[PDB]
């Protein structure tokens, strides 16, 4: 479960950076 | 006085590195674009703004230099002259560079 | 079209921006917060016009008169039913904003207390009592707030902002001594056992709060009125528990809480059980009228409206000229109303 | 200082009517609903003209169900706009189980009917006597200056009226 | 007209939680375009430009 | 500026006119546009409103030592301020009738105010780094008005004598049965049979005597003697006497005063120290 | 609006007053020319027209469960409105003689039939709910009547 968080959080920063990419 | 139409000249002048009235030609172009609507990919939550700068920090391999930019913050909280941080601090994110 | 002829015979909207909009006058010191504004812009470097909602001179005592009784204001913001303050963009001409804020704000406090005291009122027997009682004071006060409606509608105007506010100042100041007594009243819902003491402590706050103003009144005697209102109908089911105990023998309680732990002893081999609570000497006549009533009802053999009468007796002749000092007097009226039937009752005991 | 409260009744109107024409759009076939006047005195001359079995212009008679009928559509009713429309079927309903009631008066004759009781008539006999009342009492409900003096009156009568007409018109006869 | 007064009624409901922050006659015209066929995201962009347009007004 | 000055004044800050908060004397702006002149007057006009919220402060401070004179002063005090917000109101109509009256004009108008604010802000200065309480207020009010100035004069004998109604209250309680009104044991009857009665020489004015005392101390302990022995024995009575109607009366009449009569408090020492003082004269006879 | 408010609480709504068969009549949300503040008195005014609907059915069900209590019971609480519509009739010739009003007016004077009416309506619902009629019917007025509250 521990692992599976982890991961989790990684998407969440990608999606937000690619959002930013998206705008400009 | 500093009505924006005054103050939006005086930016042209300084940053084109031209007079005032030779920045013109660039001052009708910069009035359609101030003018026409765009909408910040960070809308909501002034925390949101902030942890974006402090991720920047990082990023960039200057991890000492974002500690440095909480202190600021409380700086600027506290004297309460400004009523629209968060403009401020999106416009200098923006503009970042290395 | 319709939509025009309401814009013009209703006073132009400000809830809703979407009505054109007027702030001037032809008096060279109403135009103030214009020459305000333009101060500020040219001393300070760093100056933010704010976005102001523009109202509506003098039309901001309507919503205090709303506000101070009468029902939610959803043209100014409460944070909750208890915390009542004044959006930070009203402006009215002739003043600053600052300037404003700050009646506003005393207003605003003011109407928290009603606001509050109006969540009381549910539309036990104590509680329904006081309710009755806060709910009186309340539609009696609309009647001061309805006079003043009627000002503002009248041709000329006349009022301003601030020139009927030292006018609804007795109530103003009868509102506050009602907030002083309710805080001390109902701040007994954590305290353990909501049974019998938050009903006899509330009329025992009531009881400590007429010496506090009676005994240095007479310059407001009208906050001295206002506290026995609260308590001559708070005490009115309490006494009454005490009517139907003796001239019935047995009395009228809840079935889940005791008013004043009153019990009777089904099994005879004592008369009736007591549990001491919250005034002190009239216990005492309570435990000795039910010890002989417990008999006359299982073995014959061989108020409120006097109160009321001995209070308006001292009163057409609170302070009064015929008893000194003064509320306690009419009290000790009432310690032989109790008093002339107490001791009848008892001398039918040795009777039988 | 006027708001719309203290304006009047007539900015209620023009106001109904604005309120309504983004409705009506859609109610609209090709065209919407149009106004349709009465004044608020040919109300209060109305009100006791259906209770006595007449028409006036708002009370159209319909022989095919023996009961009145009020204008369906929208009608202005003087600066009180459609809200009298549904008070004014109230008592529509209380004069139609009169009319009902004076119906059946004439039904029992004993020209050659003998299954019509001679009690049955005698039922009549007590029954038109309780009908002429009914029309004396509306010769004393003036003056009508509002319709609730007229409406609040007949919250007695209106429950009255159901038992009274209805108990008959089942058919029971003679001994039973 | 008993119909279409109690759909809106429901819908004027739902325009104030979600904060659309529209008025009253506003929406029926705009559920009277729909049901002629409208597309939404055109019709929004078209309030949005409107809404903005009286704010600048006023003031 | 006129309207900004003229609700400051009643006790609601500007922002043009910003509070300090009773430390330091700037309590108007310098404005530009007013001339280097106007807006030098305009801070000795807000002297004589931060003297004014000096006093709304003393009110509820007061209104919760803490004593009840302290109270009674305190809703004697708001009267003294009651002609000082009606001419503020009635300044307001003053200019509406023309925009052509300025801050010379309220100069004028509110010096009325200069010769009783600072001198009632001397009253309330003493009572609150004293921290004094008790008949002692009257006898710091009393002391003030020892004093000059006319309208300071008849000012602080009419708040003299709203707090003098505190002390009518107290001492007829105590000569009817013996009732001892304390709620923070402020008044000079002390306590701590007949029970235990005693005078404290602390609490006491120079406007009563000792000697004079001593007139409300016999009496009032007679009452009390019967209020545990039997009531049918009362020399003031209470059945078969309606003298405490006659003494009800008195103090009423007497209840108000002008300034402050001494005259009139002390003959009714006499009175209620006689006539019903011969009701229990006839019993010791006896006994 | 004052008069026509009149007949919304007499129980005969426009579509201005509508009437729901769930939270009852109500004013209808942010309709153009009504002050945010109006609205929130109006809608306090039409829990009395809402109470007043739900109980003319109460009689008109039960006259002309089954009981010869249950209409007694009805006649029980048409007494209740009597003073209720003389104070809808009062409202009604003050606001034939002018037309400016404030319905701060109606709010001062119709609150009295704010705490009688919710107080009457636990009474029928506890009636229809536990389904009890007869002599019974006497005993569930009786012991509320005991209860707080003088009206």
């Known amino acids: 479960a521990i692992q599976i968080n982890f991961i989790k959080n990684m998407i969440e920063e990608t999606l937000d950076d690619f959002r930013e990419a998206c705008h400009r | 006085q500093k009505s924006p139409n005054v103050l939006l000249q005086n930016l042209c002048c300084r940053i084109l590195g031209k007079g005032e009235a030779d920045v013109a030609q660039q001052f009708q172009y910069a009035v359609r674009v101030i003018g026409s609507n765009f909408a910040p990919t960070v809308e909501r939550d002034e925390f949101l703004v902030t942890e974006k700068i402090k991720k920047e920090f990082v990023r960039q391999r200057r991890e000492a230099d974002g500690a440095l930019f909480s202190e600021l913050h409380r700086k600027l909280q506290s004297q309460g002259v400004l009523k629209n941080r968060w403009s401020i601090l999106y416009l200098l994110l923006s503009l970042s560079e290395d | ?34 020459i305000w504004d333009q101060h500020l812009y040219t001393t300070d470097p760093l100056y933010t016009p704010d976005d102001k909602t523009i109202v509506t001179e003098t039309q901001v005592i309507r919503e205090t008169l709303w506000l101070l009784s009468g029902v939610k204001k959803l043209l100014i913001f409460q944070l909750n039913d208890g915390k009542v303050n004044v959006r930070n963009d009203i402006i009215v001409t002739h003043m600053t904003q600052n300037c404003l804020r700050s009646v506003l704000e005393q207003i605003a406090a003011y109407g928290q207390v009603v606001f509050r005291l109006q969540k009381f009122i549910d539309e036990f027997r104590t509680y329904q009592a006081f309710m009755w009682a806060l709910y009186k004071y309340f539609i009696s006060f609309k009647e001061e707030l309805t006079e003043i409606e009627k000002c503002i509608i009248n041709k000329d105007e006349t009022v301003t902002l601030a020139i009927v506010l030292d006018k609804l100042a007795p109530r103003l100041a009868q509102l506050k001594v009602l907030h002083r007594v309710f805080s001390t009243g109902i701040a007994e819902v954590p305290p353990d056992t909501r049974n019998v003491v938050r009903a006899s402590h509330l009329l025992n706050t009531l009881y400590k709060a007429i010496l506090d103003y009676d005994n240095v009144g007479e310059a407001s005697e009208q906050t001295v009125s206002l506290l026995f209102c609260l308590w001559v109908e708070t005490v009115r089911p309490y006494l009454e528990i005490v009517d139907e105990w003796i001239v019935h023998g047995n009395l009228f309680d809840p079935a889940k809480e005791f008013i004043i732990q009153r019990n009777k002893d089904v099994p005879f081999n ?3 059980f007591w ?8 216990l005492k006549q309570i435990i000795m009228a039910g010890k002989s009533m417990q008999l006359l009802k299982n073995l014959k053999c061989r108020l409120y409206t006097l109160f009321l009468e001995s209070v308006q007796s001292r009163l057409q002749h609170s302070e009064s000229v015929t008893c000194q000092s003064f509320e306690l007097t009419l009290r000790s009226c009432l310690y032989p109303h109790i008093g002339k039937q107490y001791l009848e009752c008892c001398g039918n005991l040795m009777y039988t | 200082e006027p708001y719309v409260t203290e304006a009047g009744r007539e900015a209620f109107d023009k106001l109904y009517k604005l309120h309504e024409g983004g409705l009506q759009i859609l109610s609209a076939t090709t065209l919407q609903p149009q106004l349709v006047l009465l004044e608020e005195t040919d109300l209060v001359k109305a009100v006791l003209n259906v209770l006595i079995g007449v028409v006036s212009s708002t009370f159209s008679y319909n022989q095919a ?112 | 007209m008993s119909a279409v007064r109690e759909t809106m009624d429901v819908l004027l409901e739902i325009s104030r939680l979600l904060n659309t922050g529209l008025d009253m006659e506003t929406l029926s015209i705009c559920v009277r375009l729909c049901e002629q066929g409208i597309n939404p995201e055109a019709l929004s962009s078209v309030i949005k430009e409107l809404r903005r347009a009286s704010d600048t007004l006023k003031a | 500026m006129i309207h900004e000055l003229l609700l400051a004044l009643s006790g609601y800050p500007g922002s043009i006119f910003t509070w300090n908060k009773r430390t330091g004397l700037q309590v108007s702006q310098d404005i530009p546009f007013l001339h280097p002149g106007e807006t030098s007057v305009l801070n000795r006009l807000c002297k004589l409103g931060t003297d004014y919220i000096r006093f709304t402060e003393f009110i509820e401070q007061y209104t919760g030592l803490h004593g009840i004179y302290l109270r009674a002063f305190c809703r004697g005090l708001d009267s003294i301020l009651q002609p000082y917000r009606q001419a503020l109101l009635d300044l307001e109509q003053e200019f509406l009738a023309d925009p052509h009256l300025s801050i010379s004009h309220i100069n004028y108008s509110l010096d009325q105010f200069h010769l ?76 701590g049979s007949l029970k235990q009665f005693s005078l404290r020489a602390e609490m006491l004015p ?32 209470s059945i078969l006497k309606n003298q405490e109607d006659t003494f009800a009366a008195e103090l009423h009449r007497l209840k108000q005063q002008p300034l402050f009569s001494l005259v009139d408090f002390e003959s009714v020492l006499d009175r209620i120290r006689s006539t019903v003082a011969e009701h229990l004269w006839k019993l010791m006879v006896e006994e």
């Open chain 3, 1 to 34: 079209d319709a939509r025009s002829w309401l814009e013009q015979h209703i006073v132009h909207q400000y809830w809703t921006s979407r009505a054109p909009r007027f702030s001037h006058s032809s008096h060279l010191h109403s135009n103030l917060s214009a």
């Open chain 3, 270 to 272: 004592h008369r009736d």
């Open chain 3, 275 to 282: 549990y001491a609570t919250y005034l002190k000497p009239v």
């Open chain 4, 65 to 176: 169900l023996q009961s009145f009928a009020v204008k369906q559509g929208v009608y202005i009713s003087g600066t009180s706009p459609d809200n009298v429309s549904s008070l004014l079927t109230q008592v529509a309903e209380y004069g139609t189980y009169y009319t009902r009631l004076s119906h059946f008066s004439l039904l029992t004759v004993l020209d050659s009917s003998h299954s019509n009781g001679l009690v049955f008539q005698a039922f009549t006999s007590g029954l038109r006597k309780y009908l002429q009342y009914y029309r004396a009492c509306v010769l004393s409900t003036p003056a009508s200056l509002t319709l609730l003096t007229i409406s609040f009156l007949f919250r007695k009568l209106g429950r009255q009226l159901r038992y009274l007409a209805e108990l008959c018109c089942a058919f029971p006869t003679g001994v039973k």
């Open chain 6, 116 to 191: 009783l604010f600072p001198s009632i802000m001397v009253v309330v200065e003493q009572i609150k780094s004293q921290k004094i309480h008790g008949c002692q207020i009257l006898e710091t009010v009393y002391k003030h008005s020892c004093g000059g100035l006319p309208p300071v004069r008849s000012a602080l004998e009419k708040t003299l004598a709203v707090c003098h109604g505190v002390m009518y209250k107290q001492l007829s309680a105590w000569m009817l049965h013996g009732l001892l009104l304390d709620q923070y044991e402020e008044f000079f009857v002390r306590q």
């Open chain 6, 206 to 237: 120079s406007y009563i005597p000792v000697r004079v005392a001593e007139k409300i101390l016999f009496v009032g302990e007679s009452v009390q003697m019967f209020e545990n022995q039997n009531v049918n024995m009362s020399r003031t009575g």
